[PDB]
Amino acid sequence: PPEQDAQIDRLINGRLTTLNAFVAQQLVRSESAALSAQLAKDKVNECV
Amino acid sequence: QLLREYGQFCSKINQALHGANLRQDDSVRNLFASVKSSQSSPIIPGFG
Amino acid sequence: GPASARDLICAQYVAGYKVLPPLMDVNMEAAYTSSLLGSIAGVGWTAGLSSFAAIPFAQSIFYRLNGVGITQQVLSENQKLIANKFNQALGAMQTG
Amino acid sequence: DQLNSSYFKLSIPTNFSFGVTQEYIQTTIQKVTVDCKQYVCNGFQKCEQLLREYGQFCSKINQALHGANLRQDDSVRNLFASVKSSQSSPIIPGFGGDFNLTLLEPVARSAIEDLLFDKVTIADPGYMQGYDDCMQQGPASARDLICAQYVAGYKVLPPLMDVNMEAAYTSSLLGSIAGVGWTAGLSSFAAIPFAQSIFYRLNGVGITQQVLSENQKLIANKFNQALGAMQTGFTTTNEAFQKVQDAVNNNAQALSKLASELSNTFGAISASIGDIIQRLDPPEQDAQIDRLINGRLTTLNAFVAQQLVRSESAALSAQLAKDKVNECVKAQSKRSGFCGQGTHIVSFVVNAPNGLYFMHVGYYPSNHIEVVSAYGLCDAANPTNCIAPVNGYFIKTEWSYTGSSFYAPEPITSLNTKYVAPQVTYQNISTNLPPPLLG
Amino acid sequence: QQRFVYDAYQNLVGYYSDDGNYYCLRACVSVPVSVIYDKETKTHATLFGSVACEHIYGPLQTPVGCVLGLVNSSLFVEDCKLPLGQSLCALPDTPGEMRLASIAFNHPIQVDQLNSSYFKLSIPTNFSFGVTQEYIQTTIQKVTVDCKQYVCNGFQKCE
Amino acid sequence: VSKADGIIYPQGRTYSNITITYQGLFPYQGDHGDMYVYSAGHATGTTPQKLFVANYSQDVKQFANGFVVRIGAAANSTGTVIISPSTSATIRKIYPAFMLGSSVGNFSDGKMGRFFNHTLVLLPDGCGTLLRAFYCILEPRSGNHCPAGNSYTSFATYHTPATDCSDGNYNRNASLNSFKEYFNLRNCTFMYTYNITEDEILEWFGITQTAQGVHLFSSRYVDLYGGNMFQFATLPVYDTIKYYSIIPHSIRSIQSDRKAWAAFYVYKLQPLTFLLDFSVDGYIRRAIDCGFNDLSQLHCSYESFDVESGVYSVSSFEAKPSGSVVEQAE
Amino acid sequence: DCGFNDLSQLHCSYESFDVESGVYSVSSFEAKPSGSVVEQAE
């Protein structure tokens, strides 16, 4: 169990970092999409 | 058990992803309301 | 079984993550765009959104061309020519 | 339905309503500076020695946080300079005449501005004596962020401009709103009643002057009703009020993270380094100290990165707020949906905890009816002589003039018509002729 | 019976003494220190955030916090050399001590509305031309990094 | 869990006016558990005769991580005596008897319930005035109606209310003497007596095994009204106990004095994450068990019993393999 | 085989034999020592 914990911790640290990175990536993408959606609303009123 | 010693990382991951997804839903509703027009002419074959 | 080898959708289920559906269905979104197209023909008659005038799309295009600066007499003489050029541009867009 | 004829069907409202659209823009974020030496090492020399081997992490953290905070100050100064108006009319009780502006009147913050701050839940900053207050009264709230900041050593800096100065900027803007939107350019300011400015804006949307004079009192009552609804507007349902609460919550979440991370073991035997020293021999204790340092380093770098991203977002949002103030508050906006929904009439700006709160009054059409209309009218005797309606439509009733925004038949006159070249679509009249065509 | 009382953060916020008198426990609180420095003066002013000067010319009590060795300017300047937060600014004496100068709200020209059909108009009799300079960053330097060389320094065992 | 039933306060520290998730041995939410009830022995007129009880001793349950017991749940309620349907008496709080053994011994008749080597026995004594805990090797007596003896349906500890519980004279060891007939006590390691005040109020008893020793928790000692269990006794038992058998108790009430006895419910303890609500006093009155359902998982994830209306993702249910799969070389 | 040529290195890095037209950076060529210098007074 102590020996297995260090290797399990390496998997846990990588997976926790990956999940945190995925949440951060989704947050940045969602923020970009929301700003782009506001631009689309302006374009529809201005040109369409 | 090892993750619990670090903290409730799993609970935080689920809540953050749900919040971004709800934000995306709010953006879609706002954009579609802007595109919608109060008065429109029915589309017919040979329109234009 | 997976639709394609190394299918991303199947990979999500094995990991346990799920992709949520969009807020609005395709048919509702299509209805919004269809209503917008009907509004486009008569929306640009005068300033303000309070009143909507139902006019032909061709009549609106001629008014827009008068606004850019083409004279009304030229528009009347080239009515068919203007329509043909617009149709050619849309055909290029289809193969665009 | 489109008509297969020279005549075209027109849908025009016979009733009008005034509604206020509430918008919140976040121009600022709470400025946070973290003491790396206290947070990462808990004032322990051994941790500082290990941190030095990694590098001067503490020096980098302090400089980066200062830079974001100075950038926030620069953004606030630019935004307020843009909002300020060169010429303004002094605010007086009963401002706006029949229209009631008492809610927007400074009480000094306005009544709507004071109410918004009261409705939002904000922990007291206590900048003058917070350190003493936390010790004497204990935590203000359970898990109080302000008391936690002192224990951690991180401090939240005060904003670039005090509340009274910010209130003065909004008060001057409110006074200048009627005068600025009367002519193109900011060079000349005209002191005019707010009611007179509103009537000119309504004439611009397309309501006829005769209708405005007949419905003067009715227009004032409808505007007052919309402002009264705005006073009761703040609620859980209101999206703009919720956005203000969310901005306060986001600042609160960042402060909470620093305190929670200190507690996290990060694989160390004890959260407290001093407890580790008592619990374990020094070489074994050093490894536990290193685990705490690595987690604290990750948290401090992540917090600085989070503050940088938030500061960048606030600066872009502040530029949007400056554009909105000039486009809607300082002039009626032709653009649709940039300010209020429907046809924008006037906008008002009041300060918000992390930005500016924008309220836009809009004209909403109702009771639409369909009437036959003509693109233009030409004399049958003279084909060349023709007229086209200006900001209006020609409607059968024979031909009368109606304002585009409101449906009212009125006699056709030279003032409401423009001479135009003859078109096939334009109708030819051999009966009664309108006066511009009576040539 | 438990004796040790802990908050949600898990910090020790209460303890029961052997005598049985409960004592709230607050970790020693650090006093925040910030430095206001002007390069031309080559002199600095020590600033403490949110701290009553009772814990620190002598110090000056201000709404922002406690500033050591500070003399109030007692004057209002629209320009601010060093922002202290709120309506405050540090203003170098130029060297002497920095002054605590309150930022001054510039007042717009006031035109009085007339209760008459005639309306007062403020119109300029003189004109001037000024140039506003703006910079927009259209592009950034493009950087490509060889990961293998940077991470392993060209060592096979690292690869 | 919302009623704080079966909840044991953490020994290490107290939390005041806060809500946080804590990991501890806790009973499952909505768990009926195992119910054991004690009934008066058969009696004719004023003379008690043959004992009447179910075969709780024959039944053996794994000790596992330990168990929490609800005491006097039906106490002070209208009831009918279990032995006689016609006879009805007000329910009276009674105290459970527990026998815990590391290994299961075999009886001379081969019946279950014997425990090999030292056996930890918790026995209510003096009509519940005191609780006696001892770790002792148990020898079946060869007498008739004893486990070694033939024709014994079960071994049941017994007491007489008329004599043992008399206000003038209380016999503390009377229950112990009855236990001595059923099982001989050989080389008992220790003898511990803890006095429990007689009451009809609901009580909770929990027993768990830890490296330091077995721990006994009673709600009455610190928070009787709360029902939160607080450790009152420590047992120096260093041998893990794998099996526990309830000792049936038969009360020698006279036919006229037969009374209904409150049933005691035993709930197994398993490590669980419990969201905990702490009052200003710091005692727990409300909690959520995440394992019971998805709504409970949502409350544990957010860490709030009451949450704003929304659709929130929670941990997905995961399939578990029925059995391991093994192949062969050829 | 990435070692033979830079185009091969690009195919190995991308992990696709066929790739769309583009300019792609690859591991830089590394100068390799042909000698050892040991200025040591021992």
Q: Do D423 and C42 touch (CB under 8 A)?
A: no
Look up residue F153 and give its two tokens.
């349906």
CB D326 within 8 A of CB D180: no
Chain D interface, best mutation among E111, E132, E134, by max D CB count within 10 A: E111
Q: Is D400 left (phi over 0), alpha (psi -120 to 50) or beta?
A: beta
Q: C-alpha angle F66/F72/F270, rounded to 5°?
A: 20
State the Cα–Cα distance between residues F119 and F185, nearest whole angstrom: 10
Contact with chain G for residue E148, Cβ under 8 A: yes
| Residue ranges of D 354-383 with Cβ closer than 8 A to chain B | 365, 368
Q: C-alpha angle G30/G34/G40, rounded to 5°?
A: 115
Contact with chain C for residue A48, Cβ under 8 A: yes
Q: Do D393 and C42 touch (CB under 8 A)?
A: no
Look up residue E81 and give its two tokens.
């050399």
CB F91 within 8 A of CB F111: no
Residue with tokens 């717009």: E108
Query: Is there an interface between E and C (3+ Cβ pairs < 8 A)?
Result: no
Among candidates A5, A19, A34 on the partner chain, residue whose Cβ is nearest the Cβ of B2: A5
* Residue B4 one-letter amino acid: R
Asked whether the CA dihedral D78, D82, D86, D90 is positive or negative, the reply is negative
Strand D87-88 relative to strand E109-110: parallel, antiparallel, unpaired?
Answer: parallel
Burial (CB < 10 A; 0-12, 13-18, 19+), residue F63, is buried
**Neighbours, chain C (3 or more CB pairs < 8 A):** A, B, D, F
CB F94 within 8 A of CB F100: no
Chain E interface, best mutation among G12, G25, G26, G28, by max E CB count within 10 A: G28
Chains D–F, number of C-beta pairs less than 8 Å apart: 3
State the Cα–Cα distance between residues E33 and B26, nearest whole angstrom: 43
* Distance between first and last Cα of chain B: 68
Query: Considering only CB atoms, which chain E residues are within 8 Å of G30?
Result: 149, 154
Burial (CB < 10 A; 0-12, 13-18, 19+), residue D51, is buried
C-alpha closest to that of D388 among D417, D429, D354: D417
C-alpha closest to that of D113 among D178, D38, D35, D166: D166
C-alpha closest to that of D380 among D393, D395, D398: D398
Helix, strand, or coil (residue C74) = helix
CB F71 within 8 A of CB F205: yes
C-alpha closest to that of F58 among F19, F121, F114, F11: F114
Burial (CB < 10 A; 0-12, 13-18, 19+), residue D416, is buried
C-alpha closest to that of F286 among F302, F270, F304: F304
State the Cα–Cα distance between residues F241 and F244, nearest whole angstrom: 8
Q: Do B20 and A12 touch (CB under 8 A)?
A: no
Chain C interface, best mutation among D4, D9, D10, by max C CB count within 10 A: D10
Q: Do E112 and D165 touch (CB under 8 A)?
A: no
State the Cα–Cα distance between residues D358 and D243, nearest whole angstrom: 12
- The alpha carbon of residue E92 is apart from the nearest alpha carbon of chain F, in Å, by 49
Q: Do D375 and C59 touch (CB under 8 A)?
A: yes
For residue A42, the chain D residue with the least C-alpha distance is D338
Query: What single string gives the DSSP state of each residue in D383-428?
Result: SS-EEEESSEEEEE--EEEEESSS---B---STTEEE----SSSEE
Contact with chain B for residue A40, Cβ under 8 A: yes
- The alpha carbon of residue F291 is apart from the nearest alpha carbon of chain C, in Å, by 19
Chain C interface, best mutation among B13, B23, B34, B37, by max C CB count within 10 A: B37
Q: How far is CA D424 from CA C56, C61, C66, D6, D378, in A?
A: 14, 16, 15, 8, 10
CB F99 within 8 A of CB F119: yes
- The alpha carbon of residue D302 is apart from the nearest alpha carbon of chain A, in Å, by 11
CB D82 within 8 A of CB D322: yes
State the Cα–Cα distance between residues B44 and C17, nearest whole angstrom: 45
C-alpha closest to that of D348 among D339, D358, D338, D333: D358
Burial (CB < 10 A; 0-12, 13-18, 19+), residue C1, is exposed
State the Cα–Cα distance between residues C45 and C59, nearest whole angstrom: 10
Q: How far is CA F92 from CA F47, F72, F75, in A?
A: 21, 7, 5
Using the CB atoms, write b or e for F262-293: b if 16+ within 10 Å.
Answer: bbbbbbbbeebbbbbbbeeebbbebbbbbeee
D247 alpha carbon, distance to own chain's centre: 13
Strand D8-25 relative to strand C52-53: parallel, antiparallel, unpaired?
Answer: antiparallel
CB D172 within 8 A of CB D84: yes
State the Cα–Cα distance between residues E3 and E14, nearest whole angstrom: 8
Query: Is there an interface between F and B (3+ Cβ pairs < 8 A)?
Result: yes
Q: Bridge partners of F62? A: F243
Look up residue F91 and give its two tokens.
């329910």
Query: Is there an interface between G and B (3+ Cβ pairs < 8 A)?
Result: no
Query: What single string gives the DSSP state of each residue in F257-285?
Result: T---B--EEEEE-EEEEEEEEE-SS--EE
The enclosing H or E element of D271 equals none
Contact with chain C for residue B47, Cβ under 8 A: yes
- The alpha carbon of residue E29 is apart from the nearest alpha carbon of chain F, in Å, by 22
Among candidates A9, A31, A45 on the partner chain, residue whose Cβ is nearest the Cβ of D337: A45
CB C79 within 8 A of CB C56: no
For residue D163, the chain E residue with the least C-alpha distance is E86
Q: How far is CA A3 from CA A10, A11, A13, A15, in A?
A: 12, 13, 16, 19
Q: Do D1 and B42 touch (CB under 8 A)?
A: yes
Q: Do E109 and D87 touch (CB under 8 A)?
A: yes
Look up residue C95 and give its two tokens.
């193969």
* Residue D41 one-letter amino acid: C
Helices (H), ranges, D192-234? 194-205, 209-214, 216-231
Q: How far is CA D400 from CA D236, D394, D409, G17, in A?
A: 48, 6, 6, 75
* Residue E72 one-letter amino acid: N
* Residue F206 one-letter amino acid: G
State the Cα–Cα distance between residues E75 and G1, nearest whole angstrom: 77
Residue with tokens 């991303």: C8
Look up residue D288 and give its two tokens.
């536990």
State the Cα–Cα distance between residues F288 and F166, nearest whole angstrom: 45
Q: Do B36 and C41 touch (CB under 8 A)?
A: no
Residues preceding chain discontinuities in chain G with C to N over 2.5 Å: none
* Distance between first and last Cα of chain D: 36
Half-sphere CA count of E52, side-chain side, radius 13 A: 10
CB E149 within 8 A of CB G25: no
* Residue D279 one-letter amino acid: R
CB E59 within 8 A of CB E52: no
Query: Considering only CB atoms, which chain F residues are within 8 Å of E3?
Result: 14
Strand F203-209 relative to strand F67-71: parallel, antiparallel, unpaired?
Answer: antiparallel
* Residue F242 one-letter amino acid: K
For residue F302, the chain B residue with the least C-alpha distance is B11
Helices (H), ranges, chain F? 161-164, 174-182, 219-223, 294-302
State the Cα–Cα distance between residues D127 and E135, nearest whole angstrom: 36
CB D433 within 8 A of CB D379: yes
CB D434 within 8 A of CB D410: no
Beta-carbon contacts of D384 under 8 Å, excluding residues fewer than 6 positions away, are D421, D422
Q: Which experiment gave this structure? A: cryo-EM
Q: Would you mind telling me the total number of residues written for chain C in this entry?
A: 96
Chain G interface, best mutation among E149, E152, E155, by max G CB count within 10 A: E149
Burial (CB < 10 A; 0-12, 13-18, 19+), residue D152, is buried
Query: Considering only CB atoms, which chain G residues are within 8 Å of E146?
Result: 25, 27-28
F221 alpha carbon, distance to own chain's centre: 16
- For residue E27, the 8-state DSSP code is P
Query: Is there an interface between C and B (3+ Cβ pairs < 8 A)?
Result: yes
Largest interatomic CA distance in chain G: 58
* Residue E55 one-letter amino acid: H
Q: How far is CA F17 from CA D82, D136, F282, F284, F290, in A?
A: 48, 20, 6, 10, 21
CB F228 within 8 A of CB F24: no
Q: How far is CA G42 from CA F29, F225, G37, in A?
A: 77, 84, 14
Query: Considering only CB atoms, which chain C residues are within 8 Å of D375?
Result: 55, 59
Half-sphere CA count of F246, side-chain side, radius 13 A: 23
State the Cα–Cα distance between residues F34 and F70, nearest whole angstrom: 11
Query: Is there an interface between A and D (3+ Cβ pairs < 8 A)?
Result: yes
**F182 φ/ψ angles, rounded to the nearest 5 degrees:** -70, -45
Count of beta carbons in the 10 Å neighbourhood of residue E148: 16
Query: Considering only CB atoms, which chain C residues are within 8 Å of B10?
Result: none
Chain B interface, best mutation among A5, A7, A28, A41, by max B CB count within 10 A: A41
Query: Considering only CB atoms, which chain E residues are within 8 Å of D84?
Result: 106, 108
Residue with tokens 């209460």: E14
- The alpha carbon of residue F15 is apart from the nearest alpha carbon of chain B, in Å, by 18
Q: How far is CA E11 from CA C17, D134, D260, in A?
A: 35, 16, 10
Strand E121-122 relative to strand E109-110: parallel, antiparallel, unpaired?
Answer: unpaired
**F259 φ/ψ angles, rounded to the nearest 5 degrees:** -135, 150
CB F13 within 8 A of CB F266: no
Residue with tokens 């004439």: D203
Query: Considering only CB atoms, which chain B residues are within 8 Å of F23?
Result: 4
Helix, strand, or coil (residue F35) = strand
For residue C17, the chain F residue with the least C-alpha distance is F316
- For residue D324, the 8-state DSSP code is H
State the Cα–Cα distance between residues A17 and D62, nearest whole angstrom: 25
Using the CB atoms, write b or e for C40-74: b if 16+ within 10 Å.
Answer: bbbbebbbbbbbbbbbbbebbbbeebeeeeeeeee
CB D373 within 8 A of CB D388: no
